[PDB]
DNA sequence: AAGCTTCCGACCCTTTTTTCGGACGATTTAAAAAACCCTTATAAATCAGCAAGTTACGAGACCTCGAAAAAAGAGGGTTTCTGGCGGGAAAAACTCAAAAAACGCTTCGAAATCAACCGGTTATAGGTTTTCGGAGCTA
């Protein structure tokens, strides 16, 4: 459950892509990037504004 | 003489190592404080077993919190067991057809027959014993 390995393929010239991930996919995003900082503080205060547009 | 390229000195900034100083701890030494000894006849403690009254120490219990262990829950993965669907081959129904084969007409006269009872025939249900086929096994 702790395994998190990402494999990137350089297609040559200007392009590269993500082939596969082994283990916890949540440690990477779709393009294979990794978050740089993590917090449990309540950033992104969704509670403040609501969708009742009318 | 000019442009390009390469060293070199000067400097700026931060990190890494060394040195020095300071502080703290430990030990040693010296000084100060508490204590010990020497004089006491008289006053108070020693103690004998048991009664009568009291409690300082032990045991029991519960709570409280914190941590540890275990169990559960989650997620990663692989192996296999089953079900559904698709595809090719064989079977058998379905469709098309002929050629027999039966049936009817239709037989007056020739068998067929049932009945009970005896002895005799023999197909074979059932059981008993046994080759053939396959088990794979092993390099």
From Swiss-Prot:
Disruption phenotype: Infection with phage DSM3 inhibits biofilm formation; disrupting this gene restores biofilm formation upon infection with DMS3 infection. Normal biofilm formation in the absence of phage infection. Decreased production of crRNA in the presence or absence of phage. Disruption of the entire Y.pestis-subtype CRISPR region disrupts crRNA production but does not alter phage resistance (possibly OLNs PA14_33350 to PA14_33310, plus the flanking CRISPR loci), indicating this CRISPR is not involved in phage resistance. It comes from the Bacteria. Signal peptide: none annotated. CRISPR (clustered regularly interspaced short palindromic repeat), is an adaptive immune system that provides protection against mobile genetic elements (viruses, transposable elements and conjugative plasmids). CRISPR clusters contain sequences complementary to antecedent mobile elements and target invading nucleic acids. CRISPR clusters are transcribed and processed into CRISPR RNA (crRNA). Cas3 plus Cascade participate in CRISPR interference, the third stage of CRISPR immunity (Potential). In this bacteria Y.pestis-subtype CRISPRs do not confer resistance to phage DSM3 or MP22, but instead are required for DMS3-dependent inhibition of biofilm formation and possibly motility. In the N-terminal section; belongs to the CRISPR-associated nuclease Cas3-HD family. In the central section; belongs to the CRISPR-associated helicase Cas3 family. Interacts with Cas1. This is CRISPR-associated nuclease/helicase Cas3 subtype I-F/YPEST.
């Amino acid at each position: 459950r702790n395994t998190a390995v990402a494999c990137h393929w350089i297609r040559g010239r200007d392009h590269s892509e993500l082939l596969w991930i082994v283990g916890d996919a949540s440690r990477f995003n779709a393009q294979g990037a990794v978050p740089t900082n993590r917090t449990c503080r309540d950033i992104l205060r969704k509670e403040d504004e609501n969708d009742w547009h009318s």
